């Protein structure tokens, strides 16, 4: 498993990369860890396949009833869903879960929990286990409001550390962009980003 | 259990102006059951005393076992043994098995014929000195005596102040124990005449 | 060490004798050259010689 | 530790030690092992020290509640099992119970009951219990006759109990005697265990092996 | 069921004459791997108490919510007492303890260290110090985590004793804060050099002086290490 | 993994006299070998010439003296205005340790004051629940080093006559409030040479039909 | 339990406290935890008391045997290989976290040793239980280059820190000062506190005032004509 | 463990050990002795671990013996039961266990004086006026102390012998259908039938 | 102990119990009833865990005297085991397991035919000719299809029983200290003294 | 502990910093790892610092023999050492290290050798327990070939992610660098780093 989250200038961009095992033994490796709970607001899931999935629809159907009422829920309030339940099941249960959205007043804003839960904004948030390998990389070569094609091959040269040194992440890099414009995805496929 | 516990066995050792003390408890049980009201744990190996407790065989090897050492040093160098060099010689064999160690606390008590001086030394179960010149107890209900003594004690005591001093301490402290007591045999040690008296406490 | 009690006369003359015996009886050895007079009380002989 | 009770003519005497144990350390040695389930029951305390006063004490409260609604006398089989029927269900939630309840009364006579703490019970005319009750057996029932007077009973209560003391780590404190009459237990003291040595050491010529 | 996931350590604290220092490290670990940055873990609680919590940031977070709401609570009516006398250190302080107490019944606790140090409307120095453990005790001296056998020991050479206090004033206890913080970075693991300092004096409020670093470092005689041979 | 009992150490210590009581206490706070404090009161009046204190893991020790209070209130209130006796209060105590005991309290409590006639009364409880009149009784981890000299020299245990030898028993001498300050004061000397966990102060409170007086005496910083 | 060990520019400084524990109760008021390798080479030590003093008694007299033989003065190295070696021998199942310092020809040294095998080099180092105590005020007072007065002034007061702190340190503050080319100072008890009280009163008992149960003597003298 | 009991009467040691044995769950055998006659005027008894007992009884006659032919002339039994200490003693060191528990008596004719000695399976020599190993030595230790003398005729040591069997029997769960009597004495060592 | 034992003849059920009960570290009481009367011709002996004896013994006591007075109709010993057979399967599947083994023998006065159940702890009735519990139980049987005839009347019944108690005597290692013999006769259910 | 060797034109230059924990509690400040063994070939130790030191000292003892009998033993030789006694000591022996080392005709070499001991030459090594992080900042910003001062600022920046993100890793950066030339120390306090 390997995801991350960059901002940059008019939004941000949510990456990961797709292969899913179970043991030695990959189960799938098109599968997709980029998650809608909220239509601007996507999620990206890693530790236990099942604890993350049954995690993501609660607080779906607690977004979704947000909006019906209260008008469409900020990215700071869809993280506090995440938080308070990954609080009652810390110890029952295990995530990852990287909160990323767009906003229409503040752009777009990461933040990042944790199994215990507990919420901290950053500019870029990084999780899994292709995260203790590639976070070097990120730090030194980071500022902020960078341009869009700067983001775009910066979470690309990342996500290529991560799948070539830790071998629990691979298959395609997906990518996210929430941006004003839309929800836009990207694919790069291994022969690019080998090269790239 | 621990092995020191399974027979019990105190030893208490106090100093004084031309004359050391050493007394002892004569209980040894098989844990709750007692098997004699009498056995003296205290030897003496020319005008050094020994006191031995800790685990109830190794009162008896380890006593037999400075038997034939002392021996060798007598023997040899054709003197009685002082005061000092037993109480190395105890620390050098407590550490001889340090895999497989033995379980005993011994306390030197004596006075040296070089000088004329009182000298003391306690041990643990692996052994190094513990000098005082003070006082020493080592046993099981050692924790009890430590306090008990302290309170009681005043620095150069006479010769039978000295032995109301360790009878009423040693009494109080094995009635307050259940695996020491039954009787108490309490050594005057002078500079020419060691006096042997029991003490007439509670049994029960 | 063993018995606790003190060793009669006629044992450790013995044992020594054997020592002696050892040296004679093999290993290409030279005898050790020495002749006691052992004098020793015992409870059972009393005095012996 | 030991509690002994045996049934005579006279009634019972209950005789019990006063040494409480913590550890290898003594704690105190002034315990009252006599627990007043009214003037007309004596309850004995051995095993846990906490857990079988307690439950006692609120065995003496349905005492008073058998005896009011009743306009009579709780009798000494109804007890028993009241107190049985409650430590069964704390029977492995890790809890321990080692009373003998003693009493006499007028349409039933002396009787003992055994109330463990699986809710075993147990009726008979001797029981020990205790970490003393082999040291206490022997000697009790070699000088056993059932056919004995009062004084000689008193002294029995005693004689079982020093025996106990002399070889157990954990015996000795004081004794107490008390003999339950069908009128009420009239108490009978204490006695120092160190103190009562000496005179039967005298008197019968025991303790041979204690030297002096 | 609980253990510490991811950890704080080290808030230390000490009377003066008109009021208290509290200050306290800043990083939010995950043992070895620094995993968070910057954590702010004076929590401001009211404006004449700082709340300093240190162990689990997913424990203080939770809790963080229920001061607020303390404070809330205590405003509803009460025109002469609603931000007048609504608050003393010591309100605060009791109510955390039986929280926690009943967190420990049930063995589960909040995992935290908390110290709660502020000025009362008595000017009376109040410093008082709660835990998983739920021991309750004053001290004039204090300290949490890994300074609690560390710092500790350096800040009971100003406070001798209770006598001490009214001769040490604002200026030297900034010093004694200071010279612990530097420390603490230099033989703990888990410590940084972004650390906040508090003052709660009763005279000037809240001074929250913010993002300090450690400074006049000694690195001269590393140099000066050679082989073991 | 969580494990809720530690020790927080101090020592306490019950004796009982003629007219008074005295039940004193260290004020050292300790966990492991850091010091906490030099100065925390564990001896608490409670009212009604009773003073209790509560010694052992600290939190426990705090939770008792908690409700113990809270009952002298709810009493006084159902009875509008009665004064709540030694006798009264002892097994109060017991009833709130002994309901847990599947999550119990680990401390070894005390209470001292006058009862009805005006002599000392001092009852002391073991962890679980039930209790026991005494007459000296110290607790805590310097216990064992108190005890054994202060049945020497209240009740002169085995002692005897001088120059009879074990032929007479020496009588029960009695017992002053000045008297009793003092063999406080020499025990607690005792107990900081040789066990770590006494030290800094010591807190003697007297409680009499007069009132409850507070005395401080310094004890050795270490 | 606080050993600090503390080099200055002429030489290195070594305290220690003489509070030696068993677990709640203090055995003895007064023990040193000094030793001596050499003359010119002390050591202290701290954990299993016995795992110290049998440990610099055998190494002890092996780099005394040395020393006659190349009939050269000691060195500090000589002592503190020999003691690495050792105790990894046994793996750790000897306990020894000993301060090695001291003075030769060839300069002033210090070094530590831990039970596996471990060493370290510092110039202000500290072993105990009390250690954090004692480090605290080191890391702030201390500097380079250091003279004797200033030194022993540093020395003490880390240890005190440590008395104060630490409950298993307490009692008299040893010192021992070892300087380059000048012997080497013992200066016991240098700073006493920790003063016992006087009783309130004496405990003296008279004559009789325990029962005797029967009366011997025990002869101890030699075996004589009769 | 079963019955092993020892009395010191004024001239003698009364012995006595038990007939049953019971390995598994089932009594295999129940006239069966445990006591092996070390010398002319020792006898040793001894229970403890099955099977352990038997090769250990027959390792201390055979020593003891060889050791009697050399000298023609028999050690005493304090010297006996100081060999027999030496070697437990080494075992609970050594690397396989032993675990045997002895009651020798013997009737020393150069003191002139019955001496009995306990040896328990740890290492321990205490010499008693009377003695017992195991489950039996709880509930008779206090029994004999009771009634005894410090002198007592012979036929008096059997008397009180049969109280404590008699006892014994009542009050143990375990069944032992009653013991050998062996007196060893300054006539000789002989048995009685009489149970 | 863990001794109840059935030998059903062809007029009688004969149900024998344990003397002994034994506690703790000693035998308390060498003579104690360990078998109550269910119904007036349905007797339970009972034996196994201690403090589940005393109070499934009661509890089954009161409740088939709350049938047999409800209704004016003494329960079939068909009817009394199964009864007691799902409390027994009830318990395994509870809390608090029950662990007895239960012989229950009772004279059918509707068929007029003795019968005999053998319930073991599980909870799996089956009626048998004869029957035992526990490991005593096992040297019992092989004696039991020996000498059994199914023609048998009170007296040579009885006769085999006894053989059966003097085999537990040699055989065993831990006493039981003789039993109580109650017998299911015709007119009621009758105890009988001998041995 | 983050112990690392590069490679370079002219020889090999070894970097290691000096904060060694055991618990949370640092142990020395200022603490030196880089270890002379022959007198080009040094070594960098990390791991269990008992079994470090003592099987570096046995090394130290067999080199300098070959020395006095054969002639200088080669980066190579040394190397295949200290696998011979991890290999024979793999069960109990928690010991990495990195063998780098001046030959005169094949410049600088890098050997590192795993816990379970063996031999593999790489372009440049990094192990310790905070070296993890790095992997992927090292791996993309390498250049093979560079020159003297190139070196140093790469190994620099390279130790103070590692740094960074271990709290393990910290204190002043010790690098030896070996070429033909000789053998120069060169130490980084914090400040003239932690401002890049």
């Given at each position: 498993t390997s995801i991350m989250a960059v901002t940059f200038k008019d939004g941000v961009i949510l990456g990961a990369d797709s292969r899913t095992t179970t043991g030695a033994y990959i189960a799938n490796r098109v599968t997709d860890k980029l998650t809608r709970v909220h239509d601007k607001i996507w999620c990206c899931r890693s530790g236990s396949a099942a604890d993350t999935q049954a995690i993501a629809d609660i607080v779906q159907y607690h977004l979704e009833l947000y909006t019906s009422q209260y008008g469409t829920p900020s990215t700071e309030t869809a993280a506090s869903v995440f938080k308070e339940l990954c609080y009652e099941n810390k110890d029952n249960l295990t995530a990852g879960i990287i909160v990323a959205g767009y906003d229409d007043k503040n752009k777009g804003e990461v933040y990042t929990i944790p199994l215990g839960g507990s919420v901290h904004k950053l500019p870029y948030a990084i999780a899994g286990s292709g995260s203790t390998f590639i976070y070097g990389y990120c730090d030194k070569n980071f500022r902020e409001n960078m341009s869009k094609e700067e983001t775009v091959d910066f979470i690309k040269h990342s996500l290529s550390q991560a799948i070539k040194w830790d071998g629990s992440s691979g298959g395609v890099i997906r990518m996210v962009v929430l941006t004003a414009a839309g929800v836009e995805r990207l694919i790069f496929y291994p022969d690019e980003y080998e090269q790239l | 259990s621990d092995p020191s516990s399974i027979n019990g066995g105190i030893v208490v050792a106090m100093t004084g102006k031309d004359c050391v003390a050493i007394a002892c408890d004569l209980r040894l049980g098989s844990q709750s059951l007692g098997v004699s009201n009498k056995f003296e744990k205290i030897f003496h190996y020319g005008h050094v005393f020994l006191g031995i407790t800790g685990l109830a065989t190794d009162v008896t090897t380890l006593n037999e076992m400075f038997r034939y050492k002392t021996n060798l040093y007598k023997l040899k160098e054709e003197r009685a043994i002082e005061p000092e060099t037993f109480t190395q010689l105890v620390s050098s064999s407590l550490y001889?098995?340090?895999?497989g160690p033995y379980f005993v606390g011994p306390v030197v008590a004596g006075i040296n014929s070089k000088s004329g001086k009182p000298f003391i030394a306690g041990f643990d179960l692996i052994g190094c000195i513990d000098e005082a010149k003070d006082f020493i107890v080592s046993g099981t209900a050692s924790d009890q005596l430590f306090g008990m003594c302290e309170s009681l004690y005043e620095p150069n005591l006479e010769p039978e102040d000295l032995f109301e001093t360790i009878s009423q301490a040693l009494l109080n402290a094995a009635d307050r124990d259940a695996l020491s007591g039954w009787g108490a045999v309490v050594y005057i040690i002078k500079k020419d005449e060691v006096v042997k008296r029991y003490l007439k406490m509670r049994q029960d | 060490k063993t018995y606790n009690e003190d060793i009669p006369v006629e044992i450790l003359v013995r044992r020594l004798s054997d020592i002696k015996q050892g040296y004679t009886q093999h290993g290409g050895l030279r005898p050790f050259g020495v002749s006691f007079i052992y004098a020793g009380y015992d409870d059972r002989y009393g005095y012996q010689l | 530790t030991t509690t002994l009770a045996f049934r005579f003519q006279g009634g019972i005497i209950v005789a019990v030690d006063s040494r409480a144990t913590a550890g290898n350390w003594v704690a105190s040695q002034t315990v009252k092992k006599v627990i007043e389930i009214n003037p007309f029951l004596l309850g004995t305390m051995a095993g846990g020290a906490a857990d079988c006063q307690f439950w006692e004490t609120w065995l003496g409260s349905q005492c008073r509640l058998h005896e009011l609604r009743e306009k009579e006398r709780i009798s000494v089989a109804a007890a028993s099992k009241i107190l049985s029927n409650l430590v069964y269900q704390y029977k492995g939630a890790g809890l321990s119970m080692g009373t003998m309840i003693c009493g006499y009364t007028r349409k039933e006579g002396p009787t003992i009951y055994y109330v463990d703490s699986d809710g075993t019970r147990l009726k008979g005319d001797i029981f020990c219990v205790g970490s003393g009750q082999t040291f206490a057996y022997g000697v009790l029932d070699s000088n056993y006759?059932?056919?004995?007077?009062v004084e000689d009973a008193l002294y029995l209560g005693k004689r079982s109990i020093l025996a106990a003391a002399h070889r157990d780590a954990y015996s000795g404190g004081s004794v107490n005697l008390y003999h339950v009459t069908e009128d009420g237990w009239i108490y009978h003291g204490n006695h120092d265990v160190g103190e009562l040595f000496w005179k039967v050491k005298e008197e019968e010529g025991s303790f041979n092996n204690v030297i002096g | 069921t609980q253990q510490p996931i991811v950890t704080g350590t080290s808030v230390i604290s000490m009377k003066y004459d008109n009021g208290v220092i509290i200050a306290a490290d800043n990083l939010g670990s995950y043992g070895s791997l620094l995993r968070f940055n910057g954590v702010e873990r004076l929590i401001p609680v009211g404006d004449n108490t700082v709340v300093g919590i240190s162990g689990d940031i997913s424990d203080m977070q939770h809790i963080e919510r229920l001061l607020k709401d303390l404070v809330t609570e205590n405003a509803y009516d009460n025109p002469l007492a609603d931000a007048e006398e609504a608050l003393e250190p010591s309100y605060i302080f009791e109510y955390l303890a039986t929280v926690m107490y009943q967190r420990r019944s049930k063995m589960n606790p909040l995992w935290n260290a908390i110290i709660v140090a502020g000025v009362q409307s008595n000017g009376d120095q109040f410093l008082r110090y709660v835990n998983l453990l739920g021991v309750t005790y004053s001290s004039p001296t204090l300290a949490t985590g890994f300074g609690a056998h560390m710092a500790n020991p350096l800040l009971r050479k100003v406070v001798d004793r209770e006598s001490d206090i009214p001769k040490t004033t604002v200026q030297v206890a900034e010093e004694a804060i200071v010279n612990a913080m530097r420390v603490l970075y230099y033989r703990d693991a888990r410590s940084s050099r972004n650390f906040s300092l508090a003052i709660i004096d009763?005279?000037?409020?809240?001074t929250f002086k913010k993002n300090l670093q450690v400074e006049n470092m000694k690195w001269d005689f590393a140099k000066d290490i050679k082989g073991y041979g | 993994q969580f494990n809720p009992y530690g020790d927080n150490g101090g020592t306490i210590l019950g004796i009982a006299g003629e007219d008074f009581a005295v039940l004193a206490g260290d004020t050292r706070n300790i966990?492991?070998?850091?010091?906490?404090?030099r100065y925390e009161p564990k001896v608490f009046d409670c009212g009604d010439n009773i003073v209790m204190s509560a010694n052992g893991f600290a939190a426990d020790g705090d939770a008792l003296v908690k409700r113990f209070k809270n009952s002298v209130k709810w009493y006084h209130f159902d009875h509008n205005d009665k004064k709540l006796s030694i006798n009264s209060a002892a097994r109060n105590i017991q009833h709130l340790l002994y309901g847990k005991?599947?999550?119990?309290?680990?401390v070894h409590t005390i209470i001292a004051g006058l009862d009805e006639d005006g002599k000392g009364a001092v009852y002391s409880f073991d962890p679980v629940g039930s209790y026991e009149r005494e007459q000296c009784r110290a607790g805590g981890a310097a216990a064992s080093l108190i005890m054994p000299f202060l049945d020497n020299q209240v009740n002169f245990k085995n002692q005897y006559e001088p120059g009879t030898n074990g032929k007479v028993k020496k009588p029960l001498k009695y017992l002053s409030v000045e008297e009793v300050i003092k063999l406080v004061r020499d025990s607690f000397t005792s107990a900081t040479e040789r066990h770590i966990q006494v030290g800094d102060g010591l807190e003697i409170l007297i409680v009499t039909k007069d009132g409850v007086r507070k005395e401080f005496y310094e004890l050795k910083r270490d | 339990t606080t050993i600090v060990g503390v080099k200055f520019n002429n030489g290195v400084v070594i305290a220690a406290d003489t509070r030696s524990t068993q677990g709640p109760i203090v055995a003895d008021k007064n023990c040193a935890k000094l030793h001596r390798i050499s003359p010119k080479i002390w050591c202290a030590g701290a954990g299993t008391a016995a795992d110290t003093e049998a440990v610099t008694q055998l190494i002890g007299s092996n780099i005394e045997l040395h020393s006659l033989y190349t009939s050269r003065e000691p060195r500090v190295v000589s002592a503190l290989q020999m003691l690495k070696q050792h105790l990894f021998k046994y793996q750790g199942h000897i306990g020894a976290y000993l301060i090695v310092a001291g003075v030769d020809p060839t300069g002033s040294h210090l070094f530590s040793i831990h039970a596996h095998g471990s060493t370290d080099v510092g110039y202000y180092l500290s072993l105990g239980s009390g250690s954090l105590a004692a480090m605290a005020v080191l890391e702030s007072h201390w500097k380079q280059d250091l003279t004797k007065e200033e030194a022993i002034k540093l020395a003490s007061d880390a240890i005190q820190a440590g008395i104060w702190n630490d409950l298993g340190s307490g009692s008299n503050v040893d010192v021992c000062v070892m300087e380059i080319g000048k012997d080497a100072e013992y200066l016991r008890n240098y700073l006493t506190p920790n003063v016992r009280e006087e009783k309130q009163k004496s405990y003296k008992f008279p004559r009789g005032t325990t029962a005797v149960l029967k009366e011997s003597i025990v002869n101890i003298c030699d075996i004589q004509e009769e | 463990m079963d019955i092993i009991l020892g009395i010191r009467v004024q001239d003698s040691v009364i012995l006595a050990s038990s007939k049953a044995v019971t390995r598994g769950i089932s009594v295999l055998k129940d006239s069966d002795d445990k006591t092996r006659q070390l010398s002319p005027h020792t006898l040793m008894s001894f229970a403890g671990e099955a099977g352990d007992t038997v090769q250990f009884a027959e390792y201390i006659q055979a020593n003891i013996q060889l050791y009697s032919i050399r000298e023609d002339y028999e050690l005493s039994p304090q010297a006996v039961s100081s060999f027999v200490r030496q070697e437990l003693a080494k075992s609970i060191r050594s690397r396989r266990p032993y675990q045997v528990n002895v009651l020798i008596g013997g009737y020393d004719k150069k003191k002139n004086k019955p001496e009995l000695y306990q040896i328990d399976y740890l290492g321990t020599k205490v010499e008693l006026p009377y003695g017992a190993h195991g489950y039996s030595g709880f509930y008779t230790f206090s029994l004999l102390d009771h009634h005894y003398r410090p002198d007592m005729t012979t036929e008096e040591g059997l008397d009180l012998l049969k109280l404590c069997v008699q006892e014994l029997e009542k009050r143990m769960?375990?069944?032992?259908?009653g013991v050998i009597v062996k007196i060893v004495d300054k006539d000789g060592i002989r048995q009685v039938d009489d149970f």
């Open positions: - | 001889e098995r340090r895999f | - | 006759k059932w056919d004995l007077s | 009763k005279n000037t409020g809240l | 966990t492991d070998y850091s010091i906490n404090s005991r599947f999550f119990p309290y680990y | - | 769960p375990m069944d032992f259908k």
